[PDB]
Symmetry: D2
Subunit: 248 residues, 4 copies
Amino acid sequence: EAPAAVVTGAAKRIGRAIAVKLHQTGYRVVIHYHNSAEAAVSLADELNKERSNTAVVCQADLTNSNVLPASCEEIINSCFRAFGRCDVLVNNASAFYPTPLVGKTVETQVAELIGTNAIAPFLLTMSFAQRQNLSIVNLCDAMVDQPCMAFSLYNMGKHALVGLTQSAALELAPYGIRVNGVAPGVSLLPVAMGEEEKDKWRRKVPLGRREASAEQIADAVIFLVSGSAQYITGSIIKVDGGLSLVHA
Amino acid sequence: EAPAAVVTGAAKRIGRAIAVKLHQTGYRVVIHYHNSAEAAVSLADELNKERSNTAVVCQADLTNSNVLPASCEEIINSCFRAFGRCDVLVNNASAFYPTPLVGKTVETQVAELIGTNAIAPFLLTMSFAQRQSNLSIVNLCDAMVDQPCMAFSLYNMGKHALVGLTQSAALELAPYGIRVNGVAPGVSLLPVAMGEEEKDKWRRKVPLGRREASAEQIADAVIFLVSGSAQYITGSIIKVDGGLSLVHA
Amino acid sequence: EAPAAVVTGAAKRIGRAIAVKLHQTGYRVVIHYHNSAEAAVSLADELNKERSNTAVVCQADLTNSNVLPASCEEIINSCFRAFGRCDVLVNNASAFYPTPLVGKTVETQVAELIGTNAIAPFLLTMSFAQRQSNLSIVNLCDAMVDQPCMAFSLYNMGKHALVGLTQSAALELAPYGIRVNGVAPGVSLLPVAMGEEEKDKWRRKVPLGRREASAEQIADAVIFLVSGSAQYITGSIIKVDGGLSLVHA
Amino acid sequence: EAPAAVVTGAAKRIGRAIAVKLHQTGYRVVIHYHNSAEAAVSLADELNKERSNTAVVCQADLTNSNVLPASCEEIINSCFRAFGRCDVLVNNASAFYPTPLVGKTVETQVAELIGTNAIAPFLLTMSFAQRQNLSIVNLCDAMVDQPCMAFSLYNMGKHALVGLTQSAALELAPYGIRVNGVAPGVSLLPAMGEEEKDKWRRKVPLGRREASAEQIADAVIFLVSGSAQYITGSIIKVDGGLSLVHA
Ligand SMILES: NC(=O)c1ccc[n+]([C@@H]2O[C@H](COP(=O)([O-])OP(=O)(O)OC[C@H]3O[C@@H](n4cnc5c(N)ncnc54)[C@H](OP(=O)(O)O)[C@@H]3O)[C@@H](O)[C@H]2O)c1
Ligand SMILES: NC(=O)c1ccc[n+]([C@@H]2O[C@H](COP(=O)([O-])OP(=O)(O)OC[C@H]3O[C@@H](n4cnc5c(N)ncnc54)[C@H](OP(=O)(O)O)[C@@H]3O)[C@@H](O)[C@H]2O)c1
Ligand SMILES: NC(=O)c1ccc[n+]([C@@H]2O[C@H](COP(=O)([O-])OP(=O)(O)OC[C@H]3O[C@@H](n4cnc5c(N)ncnc54)[C@H](OP(=O)(O)O)[C@@H]3O)[C@@H](O)[C@H]2O)c1
Ligand SMILES: NC(=O)c1ccc[n+]([C@@H]2O[C@H](COP(=O)([O-])OP(=O)(O)OC[C@H]3O[C@@H](n4cnc5c(N)ncnc54)[C@H](OP(=O)(O)O)[C@@H]3O)[C@@H](O)[C@H]2O)c1
Ligand SMILES: CC(C)c1nc2nc(N)nc(N)c2nc1C(C)C
Ligand SMILES: CC(C)c1nc2nc(N)nc(N)c2nc1C(C)C
Ligand SMILES: CC(C)c1nc2nc(N)nc(N)c2nc1C(C)C
Ligand SMILES: CC(C)c1nc2nc(N)nc(N)c2nc1C(C)C
């Protein structure tokens, strides 16, 4: 039968593109979402119209808390309940907002930014391994070493995700599970973002002076889960048009 | 008038060596501790005997929780209460134990390892910067972060997050004249209870001298980073590992 | 018109797999070689039997010297003269042997190791760019560059320079639509010649399957990078090492 | 006996600051230079005026060639000739200029940029080790991963120098020789004038100022000192946060 994948934060944008491209490759998919219920259901309907019984949605908040491990176990469980297997996990969901060093409480900021970007990936990785061409792909960030000003908590999360990618690649290799990352530079600028700000970001990218499409990011995910990546584990592929190479 | 420093997890081992060297350089010190109360009080006593009222102790669990931000604020507050100023913060305290992917619950392991290694350092950095010369913060990192111990994902995640904080905070606090740096030990001060035969196994791996670092050697790099000789150094992580991280499998 | 690629050191092993896989993908190929004349011609014959007029050979020493810039110019020229275009350059050729710090003279060792691994890639890159769709360059790097083989300083220096080239050329050539990326093998295709103890030693270190990479698995990463599926990827180095570089001493 | 140090490209700027600082800490120094004869002799004179017979100059081109190994061996030899010992080697000399991919020939550019920044440090390291608190400090670059546009050969050279620092740290550890790097960001602005200087200054998070030569030398002094006895294969960035700033 067809293999199955879980994509977190898959209702919209890059997660959606990844879900779509996995589905087109022949995967059954769990579209995880938090708030974007309408987009998630609409996406599932469309994939199911294409091939019957090949998409389900699964709602979960991925903020850190004492119940986060159970929420992550349930996400993996939902893939098994729908499809009887879980071959691919894609950790895409992410909170991203400034937390200056010098309104959400700081405890909430910690829980959202660290939970979504790192702890949930860890717990989902745990549940995925425990339930078992298996692989996990973590959505990282090409700019981790030249971070956005005042984004310390977000940056800490993405750094933690690099650590998880390496530790899990090492530990899960004996089980045949590969763990890799895809690190976007600037990708899919919101149509609603101010045009002046869009231009500012695009002007920075050496390759084409434009942001990645969501499909370009998805392409690298597709490579990593494929038979063409069978010896690749612990690798993080930047997909950033050379943005990380530009000095101040 | 003398500068003042907070050192977390300063009762024993590397934190102790750091507190002692800072004190010897002329700093007044807050000795933070968690369970090591006798060691901490004894250390403060020793330092105060050397110079009157230049050391205080401050107890706090640095596990992630709803009360962790207030706890970190109180650690910084304790430096100001005692000394009227806080010039240096050393984020040394750290939980370290395996968390295999395949009697603590996982949510507790997350809270302790991410809390001690990453979140508390963040909240302490926030309180330090907000409460404000040669100001700086030194984070105790790990030379082996990219070749981690098997089954230590949460620990390794916590230390990676700390590298991220060191960079983000260096960038953001530079306009405020606060430098933020790291010291990354390889193998240091193996536990006296570790069998010598196993101590020799890690020792044999170290290119420079086939031995682990003393706590004092780690402290030496901290002393440098807080000194006027490092006035243009920020966002830098100094490995103190005797070549360990350069050795292939 | 079918696109054309140059592969250096393509007569055998990994370079051969790259040439074969590019050819299978529809590329016409220049098979560069140094000493392996019989294998190079044999490979050309084989590919030409598959599709007429799709493979040629080009001999050159890639050791550094006063004549190297002309040699690299002629390698690129061979692609234009044969195929009327050059879309892809793969910098695979490499000298690899120990140069301890404490028959070849040291200046010869420098010329061979830095020439093959770094300077030739630079001059070929120069020639390729100046002679100019989906254009790209792939440099064969090394996943163990930061945990190098003992006594291989010159080899390691060359591979580090190659990372620098990959990055510098990615930045500079991005405006011309030329992408520049790397593939970094761990251990790959152990020779039968090598000892049974030595080969086992290396194999048992690889977390993912306790075996070396096949040449085809290395070639798969090259194919991805030159493909339309990597159109936004430049300055990236993809490790293909089965997790070898993650394993501590 | 006082320890002795070789500093390459030490007639001016950062090399001189390092030479001056080592001398002040008690070292006897070989001031290597290439073209800056007057400046080198002048520094040796000032240092010898402070302490008699504690400085000598040594001329050498560090461009790659077949005689480069002999030249590097002779630099180390000159320290032993003058001082009877050689405790510290600082690889500071560097060529730095653009070499675009698209009147110096390319073979000259390769020779100068790879020679000065990488091959000469390798050859000096060999000769330093062979001739034996011993250590080597390499002058690297904090911006190696966000390079100057059209400086590929320079960038390759400094990357090779990171590789040397790591390889030699590993290999020379059994011999008790530590090998470390100092990676400046922007330091000492000259050739260049204001306002281009102030364009660079505005980039630096920590004080919007370039590093002083003194600040770079401070980091060198630390790595050679007893306070760094367990540090080897480490590269210390001295860049005021410059490398942390995104485009
Ligand atoms: N776009 C870029 O320029 C860029 C750059 C670097 C890295 N990345 C990385 O690439 C990935 C995708 O980027 P993107 O722009 O598509 O991301 P995004 O739109 O910012 O986030 C994707 C999804 O994350 C989910 N999410 C947020 N908070 C959550 C929570 N508490 N619990 C569960 N889910 C939560 C949201 O789901 P709901 O909508 O259902 O609420 C959201 O749709 C992310 O990991 C991101 O960090 C992106
Ligand atoms: N030792 C090494 O080989 C090595 C290697 C790499 C990195 N490092 C890093 O260097 C630093 C010093 O190492 P070390 O071996 O001296 O450290 P350690 O003994 O393992 O821990 C230092 C202190 O951290 C405090 N701590 C632990 N859990 C805590 C909690 N939940 N709340 C508050 N404090 C807590 C403890 O205080 P109490 O005793 O008072 O309870 C302990 O004394 C650490 O950051 C470590 O990760 C060390
Ligand atoms: N194999 C591995 O485990 C491994 C590990 C890390 C990195 N890599 C990298 O992957 C690439 C392929 O590895 P490999 O093992 O297939 O390589 P290899 O067999 O060691 O060498 C490839 C070719 O390099 C050519 N070459 C050597 N010296 C030359 C010179 N002076 N001038 C021109 N060409 C010269 C040779 O051509 P002729 O035979 O025609 O003389 C040789 O066939 C290399 O860049 C290597 O550094 C490989
Ligand atoms: N200054 C910065 O902003 C900066 C930034 C990053 C890294 N760095 C690194 O820090 C170190 C010092 O910087 P700097 O600006 O003081 O250096 P520099 O002035 O550009 O050069 C130092 C010396 O190198 C010598 N040199 C150049 N070509 C030579 C050759 N072919 N053979 C022998 N010697 C040669 C010159 O000696 P003569 O004058 O005697 O001919 C020169 O005085 C260098 O390694 C540099 O790459 C500096
Ligand atoms: C498209 C814009 C709004 C954007 N959105 C992001 N979303 C997440 N989750 N993570 C990022 N690093 C992220 N980064 C950007 C850019 C600022 C790079
Ligand atoms: C002395 C031994 C038990 C040891 N203890 C440690 N403690 C903390 N907190 N962090 C480490 N990275 C750490 N690392 C080691 C060694 C394995 C290096
Ligand atoms: C399989 C053996 C002979 C081997 N051969 C190599 N050849 C080149 N050119 N480069 C390497 N890094 C290289 N590395 C190895 C192993 C030590 C991995
Ligand atoms: C002060 C200016 C002229 C400058 N000079 C340099 N000299 C050398 N040798 N190396 C550099 N990386 C170097 N870099 C700069 C800046 C452009 C950073």
